[PDB]
């Protein structure tokens, strides 16, 4: 569950 900086 690796989301980019902008997400979450």
């Amino acid at each position, epitope marked *: *569950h*690796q*989301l*980019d*900086p*902008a*997400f979450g």
Partner: antibody
Amino acid sequence: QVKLQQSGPGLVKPSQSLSLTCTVTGYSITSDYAWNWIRQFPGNKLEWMAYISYSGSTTYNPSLKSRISITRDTSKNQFFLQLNSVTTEDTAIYYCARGGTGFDYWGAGTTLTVSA
Amino acid sequence: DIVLTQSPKSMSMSVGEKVTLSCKASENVDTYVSWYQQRPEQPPALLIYGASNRYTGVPDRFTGSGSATDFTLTISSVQAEDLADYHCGQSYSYPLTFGGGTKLELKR
């Protein structure tokens, strides 16, 4: 696999408000990823609007946060977008999308026409 | 918020050429640039993410590079099904942004 489908009014009076539904199949919106809303204007220019993380957090593009709101219904596994005091500058194509590593899955997107 | 400019507005070329599209940022965005393709009357589809990583399903003639500011989408061999609009967006900073897009036409 993942699947996104938009729906909602196709034509509205200016200044009115409304909600665009995004129903997803194949994945739980409480499981992971940010669930966004993106609109593309008549020129191919894309514009991010807002998203609702799987956890519940909400984020809005500063230039629209005055008149919009993202919400959800974990039960029916959907999320909606409300726009108020809409103007004609708002007619365009709206896409619901899942973001994680960039914008993963998109839907067919629905077109909206703001006219009197 | 960090502005993403796409240099080639409309690029005209032959099938089997070599096209390199450019995408620039206002500020550092590390490696968080994705490229999307959009055939007419069709929605964008992820092509390249993480600057280089090729998204599952993307053929080989597509390769990206670039580090926090200057990125490029290279299409080793152009095909007829590459004739479309290409967009790029960053996912590093809060308001996610896209560029104006780069349309790839056919030379005749």
